[model samples]
Each structure stands twice: as C-alpha cells, then as structure tokens.
Target chain A: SMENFQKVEKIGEGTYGVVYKARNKLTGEVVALKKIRLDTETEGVPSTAIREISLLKELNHPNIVKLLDVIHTENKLYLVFEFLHQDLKKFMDASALTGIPLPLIKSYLFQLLQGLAFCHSHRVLHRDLKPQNLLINTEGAIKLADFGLARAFGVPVRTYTHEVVTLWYRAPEILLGCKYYSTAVDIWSLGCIFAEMVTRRALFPGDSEIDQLFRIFRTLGTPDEVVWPGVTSMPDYKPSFPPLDEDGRSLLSQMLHYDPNKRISAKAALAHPFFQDVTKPVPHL
Target chain B: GVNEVPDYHEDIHTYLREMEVKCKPKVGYMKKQPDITNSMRAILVDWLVEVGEEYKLQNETLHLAVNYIDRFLSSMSVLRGKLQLVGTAAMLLASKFEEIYPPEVAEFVYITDDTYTKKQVLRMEHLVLKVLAFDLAAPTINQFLTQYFLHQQPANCKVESLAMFLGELSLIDADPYLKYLPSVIAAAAFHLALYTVTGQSWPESLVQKTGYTLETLKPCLLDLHQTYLRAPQHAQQSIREKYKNSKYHGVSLLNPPETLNV
Candidate 1:
C-alpha cells in the first residue's frame, strides 16, 4: 500500500511515531505520512491510533486536518494526511525577533476558534490544543492536527484522565485534578493560545503542575467561593497561595475565568472586540 | 479524473486481528456455578437492551456493555443477587465511553426502580474497570457490519434492515464462546440477508470485497440460522419487537428456509 508514496524526507519524531514528507507517485501530491511505531508485541494497535482514526473518520471540516487514507504494511500502520507548510509554533519562532503582525494574529485566532467551534459542536474534545498542533498552509489557512489525545465527550459527565494538554496550556480545573470537566476546559486552552498569540510568549510558563496553578492565580488573582462555587472542593485544591492584587477584569480574565462555567466559549470568543478587525472571511477549501 | 475504489479489507483485517488480542472476551467465562444461570444472564442482557433503547443509546454502547460484562465475569466470581448490579454498572461504563449524553448514575438507579443504591453501582464501576485493566477499546460486530454495508451499498432500505436484523441476532445467541471473528460473522449475516431477501447466491464481487467466500461463511451462517430459529423460544422479545416496526422493514417476522443449502 505504501508503494504509492515515495518518501521525500523525515519531518518529525516523537514517542509514538515518526512523520515523513512524501509524494504520491501517481498524482504527484505531497502528503504527511505518519508511521505509527509498534514497540511491543503485547500491546497491539495503540489506543491513540485507534482514537485518531475513528474520530477523524467521522469529522469532516476545512479547518480540521484531513485523513486521506490509512495504509498497513509489514506490521506497521501509516496514517496519510494532507500536507501543510508549517505549524503555529514554527511561525511564531520565525517572527520572534519582530513580533507577528496584529492583523495576522487576529486572522490566526479567528481561524483557530472557528475550527474549535466545529469540534465542540461535534461533541469531540481536542484535549491537547497547542500551537504545535495547529497547522498552517501557504495560503494562510490554519487546520487542527494531531488528535492523539482527543476523545468524544457528552452527557452524564464522567471522570476523564487529568494528564492531558501541555503544562503551559493546561486548564486550571485540570491542573487542580478536577475529574468531571467538560468543553469549558478546551475554552481555557483556547484562551491561553489567544494570549500566546498576542504576547508572542507563553502566558503562564510554569515548571510543575502546582506552579502552573500559582502562575495563573498570580496573574488572575486567587479565586474565592463567590468567584468559583466549588473551587475549594477540587481533589487537589489548596489555599496556600498568597492573595494577590486583582487586575481590572479584562477579556483575558473572561477566558481564564476561575470557574469553568464562567469561561468564554469558542463561539462567544469569536465575537469579542479583540477580534473586531479580523473581518477577512476564511477562505473556503 | 476517475475515482479509485477504496480497499477496506486490509484495514478491517488489521483492526479485527488487533481486537482479537485486545478486546476479545473469554468464552464460557461463566461456568455452571451454583449462583448464576445462563437464563439469568440472558434476562439481565434483555433488561440492558430495554434500558439502552429507553435512553436512545447507540448500538455500539450496548455491544460494549455486553463485552465488559463477559470480560469481568471471566475474571471475577459474583453472587446471583448482585448480577443486576453488575449489568447496570457495565452499561453505565459503556454509556460513559460511547454516548454523548449518558444517563447519570442517579438516572441509572432510577431506571432500576432503586433496587440498587448509587453507592453499590459506583463501587461496581471501579471493580469492572480494575478487572478489565482499563481496556475499553473493543471492536464490536456493529463496526464490521457497517464496513461491509458501506462497501455493498444495499439497493434499498429492506436489504439494510434485513442485514441489520441478522447482525443483532448474532449478539444474543447462547454461544459462551464466539468462535468466529467479527468480520467473518458480519459477512455471514450479510450473506444470509441477501439470500433471504432476493434468493441470490454470493456474488464474486462480495467474495473479493469481504475476503470471505460462501464456503468460509457456512459455519457462522449455520450458527446464525439456528439462533434465528430459536429466537421465539426466549422470553425476551425487545430485539424482535425492535425490528417489527415499519421503519426497520419488519424483517424479524420473515422465516428462514427449513434447510439452507448454501
């Protein structure tokens, strides 16, 4: 099955697998072929691979990464995806000396939220949403990619593993070991991503989970019972952090609300004045 | 430009083989113990089906729930009185995994007429997870059935319904151990549906598409036909009544041939 695609070069590597830039022999189309590593004979197809394949098969949107086909050969699995030029992380790194243009930032954020709104409406959570997973094309379009940690969620809320999302973008509820979180968690990550885009740096860069919460509290001020009704009851909640002066309520505050329920939704965030001038309509594929 | 016909057999085979290792439930996991009987197990499954229907749960959820029960029973021994507790807990876990809006624990308790406390249900939930070692990604018969249906693109709704009826029938049969892989069983069901609906033998295209010939499907097909003939003898009729509706083409009432020569 893989004979149809000739490998151009290796692009990325991680604990799960290695990715390659390849060209379709017949169509001359560029594609990203993710070769999933099967390290153990005991553990068959990895759960992450299964989750990505099944969920991505059901999700069809311009902003979401398209899984063109899956190929199996010689006891290995390769997931074929449409090729994109770069990711938000690389783009931000390249523009680090001179900050990204405000117009471009606004466009990227709008596209990010648009993709997220579609995912949330589908009842699927892209649990790990970071700049690295946001792919960019030459034409300035952004797509959500790498769904290894994503899972579909709905209804009588169940406990989810809190060990998800990168530490920099992890939600306060998740950091505090709250088990029964919902879409609000993703909204918090989006807020962090938005902040990173504007400032060109991680808003809450902390070394550990506890420190991550402190960084959030230091910036947003410590939450009281009135601000977050059940904040004190979280499994890992502690009130040791010193109370800090509260900054005037800002859009960032709304997105990073102490209460998950108080956090701004993707739909509402798109209408915020922060994105007022990002009037350019997203190009349809 | 021409559209290329997608080949699904490779992926299906890989998925089925992996599922055999990761998700296959142990056959006869429940023995003829003094406490639990096969009939009791059947009744519990029937009740689960009804609850799933009431809550509008997906067919996948029901299949997963049954998978969890069998796997748990294979490892742990339990009393007959607590059988319903195990069933409800398994269903709840499956719902949480598969449903967008699963019924809450309180709702599950209410559905049981409050016979079991929420505390008991919660305890069983943990026990089931521990016993299963957090292995929740099981491939069900429905997954394979959908794949074949996508490939065939049945001409009308009746063919689809008839195929679905046979697929669901394969689930409730008293086979402590399902000897056939899900793919083979799914093919057998589709083959039987085609034969019953149109009196057509297996086509060459189907043989190549499913990687199964009529010869390969014979054993599973015989098992499914036997199960169908015995369906009326069982007390539970939810599956039968489910397909009796006009929307399903009422294919449940149709009788199979006395002896299928295929």
Candidate 2:
C-alpha cells in the first residue's frame, strides 16, 4: 500500500530487527532500511534501542553511522540509514586475493580509535566494541554502528545491566562485575579490536565469562586494589586465582590488564610506540 | 484524609481505562483520548515550535520534547482536566533530558505565564514519573532500523530520502505503536525506507529480527502509507483548516475488527 517506496533485498539480521536495501521512488535514491519489531508491553522499546538511538543521536562524527530517519507503521517501526557496503567482519572474511594489508588495518584501527575517542570524550561508554559492529564502506572507512549497551556517565552513578557485550570483548572489570565503571571499559575493547586487526584472529578466545576472566588472569596476572583504587569493592570481585608470569609491557599483556585504570586511553593507545612507524596524517579527497 | 496515589504500576491500562469510563462526551464525534490522532499531532508540533521560538532551544531538544509527549500519551490516558499539566510536565522532563543547561522552574512558569501554577507543574512531574516508574529509555525507531538497513545493503547504496521521511515519522506518536519495541521500529522503518528509495524488498534473513514475516507486514505497510497522509503542518491556521475539513471519527485503527493491510 506504500505509495513511493519500492522494496529491496534483505541485508542482515541481529537481536533487534532485519535490515534491507530500499529505494525511494520519487527520487529513485537507494537506502538501507532496518525494521524494528514492536512490543505492546515493557518500557515501550528495548534497552538495546535506547543504547543505539540515544547515543547515535548525540555522537555525530564521520566515523559513526549517520542515522537519517525513523518510520512507524502499525505493529512495527523502521530505522533508515545511509547505506553501507559491508562490515569489517565481511571484509576480513574476503578471499585471499583481498588480503587486508597491515597498513590498511592500522588505518582502520586509527579511524576506529578516532570514533571511540569522541565517544569517550563525551563520557559516553560504548560497552560493545567488536569487528561485527564496526561497519566499513567500499573505501574501507570504519564507523561504530551499535550502541545498544552504551551509557552516558556523570556524577551520581546509574545502574547498568550486567548483561553487556559478549564475553570476548568484555573488560576484566566488567567480567568481575564492577557496577561503577569508567571510559576504560571501551579502551579494553579497542585494544581487543586492535589485536584482532593485527593478528586477523581473536587474541584471547576464552570459552565462557568465568573462563574469560581466568584466561585474562592467567596471562596478565590479577591486579590488587593498590593498582586499581576500588577493585575490592566490585560486586563480583574474586581474588582466588594465582598470578601469571608474563610482563605487563607486552602488547597482549597491556591490553588484558586486570586494572581498568591502568588501561590506555584511545588517544594514548594510538600514539603508542607500537604505532610510531605506522601512523601518518593524510587528507581524504 | 490524605489521598494515597493509587499505585498504577500493576495494572495501569485498566486504571486509565476505568478513568475513561467516567468522562462525559462532548458534542463532537471523536472521544477526548483518541482525538490525539494525526491532525492533533500538528497541535503538539506547533506547541513545540512555540517553545522552540521562545526558549531558543535547538531542533534536537524540540524533537526530543515532542517525542516524550508522544510516547507518554501513547500508553497513558490524559484526562482533559490534566491536559495542561501533562503537557508542561512532558516539556520539563524533556528539557532535563535533552538540554545541557535546562531552563529553571521559574522559566517554565514564564513560558506558560500563569496558565499553570508552579505547584501544579511539580505535582504533574511526580505523577508522570510514578506512572512511568522513572523509565526514560524508550528506543527511537528511526535509529535502530537505520543501522540494520546499512548492514543489509551493498557498500554503496544511498538511503537519505528513506532516512528523512523515517525521521519525520519519529515525530509522530503512531510510529512508536507500529513496532513491538521502540528499539526495533528503526529496523521496520528501514525495511520500508529501502522501498521508498531503491525499489526492492530486503532479503529474508535481514528481516528475521523484525518479528513479522512478509505476510504480517501488510497492515503495517498500510499504516505507514496512512501516516503519510497526515504530515504535520507548521502554521496553526493550516492545522485548523485541516481539522475543520476532517470529521471527528471515533473508530480505533487498532481495533482487531478492522481489515488487515493485505
């Protein structure tokens, strides 16, 4: 019954809705469409929706997906966006001929940090940061797409849902159940993404949440409260595990640090000695 | 005896439905609550436009305020006596949520200028939150679906028109009801949005989270088309003209007896 819109092909699926390619008949412009399932009960929309829309509405930058419009039909709603070609996941899974160069990975990681830096600067924490959520265009420009678990931080702390990002991208503090978190949570994920880009594989593949903590502790060692101010006060803090033999300076060790305070900021991470030879400023024409 | 605020938490819909039972009908055709349909959405928009005019608030703030009012009214019943109070409370809350330096209590009074007392405004705030249980986390359907759509297309598709139109729909109250959850509305909009721009349907897997198959989306598509027929106009005069031409109909679009979209 729609007058000016023509249906396009389906794109992808996630916890929220189905994505599709769409077109506007009046102008004949192609676009990406995401359809949200409706619920008659409970908080109107899902918490994931709150995380994505509210944050995206605020964080407007080149490295973030541009939210163009929202539409409502009976029983369902839609989020329209500027279309993108593929995500980093698909790009990484490309044929051997399309090998992602180390410099290209570095560039993408830098842009990823730039976007994360903006989110961090505003005191907004993007709890989820994985390759799947990192979108890229034909030119390989990376944008942070999902913010379903993100929260705006200020003085009086807000209650957070412990159920955040999947175990792989979770920070140790989050793994240990620290209700009061800071920007460092995202930095941990950034480090994970960085390592994944370099190795082209997950740096640490812990099987479960507890096992993930064990893997982190086994490599980076457990951090005492002396290193992390309020480490002992977290809801799920457990110091039962033995310390590891690895040095804290190693790339894997620095990222997997048990103390979030010691974790590097987005800006500092990009400026690290590891990236000294890799970075160069150039304008995109 | 002090009147205890009846805890509407457990069964709010029944509580409001009961209140609807007590109100007397006017000579006009549409009931007070359901009158909050498309044309009246213009009034809500104009009210926001005025607030934007007076306070110099940005479009984002105005849009957020409109969204708060729309979402609130979607679930709760606003008796005629409490309409002014409800409107003021919604604006105040929106100001706090959207503005970095929101106007003071007195500024709200100055905006209304004696139409509502400061006490009335404060009381309404408590009532609204109590009913809502301080849950200000409704999803903007425009946002979620946009990401979903982008993820679906080939790397080079342009979705601006769909985005703009879908963004406009977010301003309307009906949009929230279309999707099951506010978070998923963005995805549904994206599905239709692509149709507006590219002339194609999404792949089956892309829309799996949408909770509806193609057979189920027919009525939703019809509702979206109907929403287009009711776009908001800025001028109060144009609104009045549209209102006059329109007959006040009491039929509920949500009633199951209505024909399905197909």
Candidate 3:
C-alpha cells in the first residue's frame, strides 16, 4: 500500500532519483525509496528514471541491489529498494583508513564477479562499474546499486541523458575513441575495479580522455601493431605512449587485455585459480 | 581433480522463467480502458511496425514497443486520437531502451505525419512512462522465440521466420495472445511453424527445454493458425505485407496447414 512507508531520512540524491530511508508499516522492515519527481509540468518520468527502473525490473540477483516495490502517486514515483547500510564507496573510504583485509577483498570480489557473471550470462552488461554504485548491508555483503546506466551506458554511445561523473573506471576502447565495441568494455571496468579493490586507490587516475589513456598505457604498456593486431586503425590510435613492469600475470593481466574480446569473462574469472583459497560456495539470494 | 566450471545454462533456464512471471500482463487488461478496443490497438500496432521498419529498429525493439503500448493502455483512459501519441512514445521509449542509437524525438513526430508535434510527443512519451510505472522491460514473445530457436536441434530458417511471423501476428490480437505467457506462445508458435514448414511435430528439445507437450500448447497453436489464415483478408495488412517481403522469405505467403494435428 502507498500508505505504508514511514519516512525516516533522506539517503542520497542525484540524476538517478532522490533516495530516502523508510520503514514498511506492517512488517516494520526498512526499505529505501528512490523518489522520482515526476515531470508533472512538462515531461513525464525522466529518461534516466525510465532507464533505471526498466532495467532494474529485468535484473534480480543476490549481489545486485533488490528492488522491493514501486509506489506511484499523482506527481511522484517511488522506487522501493532493499535498504543497504552503506554504499561500497562509503564503506571502502572508511576501510582504507583501517587498511582493508585481503580475506574481505576476496569475499567481495567473488560476490561481485559472481553477480556480474550472472548478469552477462543473462546478457546484461553493467556499463557502470565503480565502488560508489556497490552497496553493503549490515553484514558487509555487496549488492550492486544504481543500474541507471546498465544497458544504456555502453562506452560507444554519448547522450546527455545520464550523469557523466566518472573517468577512472572507463574502458580503453572508448578512451581510444572506438564506437564499435561490446561487453568487453564492462570486463575492462571489472579489471580496473579489481585494482582499486587491492590498493583502495585509483589505478590509473586521469583528468581527461588523453590523460586517461596514457595512465592506463603507462601501467599496462601501450599496445603496438604486434600486440593489438588492429591497434593502429582505431580513430584516436597512436603509439607515442609509455611502458610497464609486470607484477603478476594472474587475473589482473587477463582483465586488462588490450583486445576487448580477449579480456577474461566474469564467468571464467570466477573459476580462476587465483580464487582457489576463497573456497566456500557463494550463497545464492 | 579440477572442478569443471559448473554450467549454469540450467540456472539460466530457471532465471528466464523468473523474468517472464513478474512483467506478464494479465489477460483482457484492455477491458479496463474505456476508450480503446482491440481493433484500434490493431491499427496502432500496424503503424508501429511501419515505424520500426523505416527506422531499421530490430524485431526485439518492435516487440518491446508494442508490449509497452499494451501495458500503458491497460489502465489509463485515453482518447481515440491520442492512441497514436501513446504508440509513438511507446516506440520512442522502446527504441531508446533497446536500441544502441535509437531514432531521435523529431523522427518519432515525423513518423506520425506530424500529427503530434515534437513537444507533445515528448510530453506523451513522459506520460506513457508514468502510466506503465516505467515497468518497460517485460520479457517479450520475440525474445523467448529467439532463445527457443537458438538451440533448436537442426536450425531451419523458414520455420524460424514463420514462427516470428506467427508471433507478431499474435501481437495484434492481445485478447487471444495475452492469455498465455510469452514462453508458452513462443513454444506454440515454434511447434506450429515446425509442422507447417516440415510436417514435423515439436522436437524433444522443444518439449525438454520448454517442458510443454503438444496437448498443452494446442490452444495457442490453433489460435495462431486461425490468425495466419485470416491475415490475407484482415484489415491490418502491415504485418502481412511485412512478411511478404523477400527479406522475410515471404513466409506469410505460405498457407497454414489444414490442421495442427494435436
């Protein structure tokens, strides 16, 4: 019932929607409500709202934040989501000060990759992958939040439709200015995200597109003709980039594959030998 | 011993079912609308197909648009003239949601012969999003059929096209098709097409993958055959003319067999 939610406090607000903490009346359980201020005077629901809710309706997973129910009023559309205590960004910022444990990193990575594999297997590419969108419950289990860019935010397309508050997690194919790409973009995002998880610092922090590409090239070693067969053909492709020193040829290298198609899939990464020690079977929601 | 990366193709099958149940619109949902009828919906859908073809939108985008239209129209009371406005936005919304580069707002207005100006269409698009509560990612018949035929034991192009032709035909008559889930309709469409094209019944793969037998699927199969039979003389020629094209292999040119032989 729309009458049920008792407002607690404003949680977060931005392009996606205004989120608030609320309690379901009958069960008295906490559920966050993403309040979409319907464009009553002019447009209807914003395209960003349409993108998030429509895509969220299609996705359901233990690791992806759960959409509880939606409440519609005369001028407001409320998207009810299961309340997670803190977002991954909020948690990690605190964890960085404490020095995050390796065991916790393995646990979160397994859950995230498991979640992404389930998404890819069903053909959903979460184009946005960063700590801020990952939410943590009281128990610190990671559930992906804000699918506003799930299918729509492929690296190729640029519309003023969504918020562009990102640079660090973007894939090389886009930074190199290639319009033709696939789920490989998301895998590259997963790779960069894995690096941040390790050190809690932006792996290749950059201020612009060129700066971003050079940052990645300096670490992974810029791709030349022999490395990436068609490297010279991409629109912005140039070879005056820097070099790298290999640390481990494990999961990180596979994810940061210069060739998008050659990048390790989330499914394959789940079974990777590097995950040998995090042995307990991940529970399904 | 190395643990084989566990195959979750089975998990996928189960998950696909999860997608279907949540977004499935109830049968006769149009009964709630005071103004629109099935015939009006049929006309709107026909024009929508033309828009889809002209814009080079894929079959999934087309199906997603109509699904949005049906769900939108289910609750709201709309005028006869504004049905196009509703459909136009539904197509626009679906195009944006599904297409990598969907046609812009101006193109949608132009498709309507400029019946609604760009702002009005944009306004209507917003309104349509509200009515459906933005629950626009419903699992469609086209998507379900794509999955079924993707793993069909021996692929047959004629059967595949005809199955899509049959499924799209079902889109016009929601009173009949809405009674069943998309997977059910998809299986029924495939079974009927397999019989029409090769005189073969549903393969074991069909039954195994779908868990639907011939008897269970007979109802929708018969309705699809009747719809196909009537397409030649039906007032809505858009879908028929579409299948008649050489690109679709003129599958609509083939007559439905006398009986499905349940």
lDDT of 2 by residue, A187-235 (tens): 6787777667655677568898767866656554355444442343432
Off by over 4 Å in 1: A222-250, A280-285, B1-62, B65-262
Going through the candidates in order, their DockQ values are: 0.03, 0.02, 0.19
Q: In model 3, which regions exceed 4 Å deviation?
A: A1-43, A57-62, A66-98, A117-123, A137-139, A152-185, A204-227, A231-249, A253-285, B1-10, B29-35, B76-82, B105-131, B152-159, B192-201, B254-262
Stretches of model 2 off by over 4 angstroms after superposition? A1-3, A41-43, A95-99, A221-254, A273-285, B1-262
Candidate 2 residue lDDT tens string, B187-233 = 44555555554555644755554445555655555555455444433
> Which residue window of length 10 is worst by lDDT in model 3 chain B?
B1-10
Query: How do all models score by TM-score?
Result: 0.54, 0.50, 0.74
Which of the predicted structures, 1 or 2, would earn the higher TM-score when compared with the native? 1
- Interface RMSD (Å) of model 1? 15.8
Model 1: fnat (fraction of native contacts): 0.00
The residue-by-residue lDDT of candidate 3 on A1-285, one tens digit each, is 568889999988745778889998999999999888866545455666677787776678899888878776767788889998876677667767665666666778788888887776564557778888888766648877787777632112222223232678877766655545555666677777777766777777898777887776666545544554334243222222121223223677777776565667788888887677774332221
Candidate 3 lDDT over residue span B1-262, tens digit each: 0011123344555656776776676668677777878889898888888888888887888888887887777677788889999898889888878776778777887888988877788778767766776777667787667667755667788898899998888888876988888888888888888889988878787678788898888888888888878778888888888888888898989988987665
Provide the lDDT at A111 for model 3.
83
Candidate 1 lDDT tens digits, A1-285 = 788899999988643589899999999999999999643222334556656766677568888999998775435778899999888888777767777666666687788888887777654688888888889887778888898888755232356666789999888777777757777777778778767776678878999877887787766545444454335344222222221122212455666776665566777777877765575433222
**2 against 3, candidate with superior TM-score:** 3
Writing each residue's lDDT as its tens digit, candidate 1 over B98-128 gives 7656787777788878888877776676567
Q: What ordering of candidates by TM-score runs from best to worst? A: 3, 1, 2
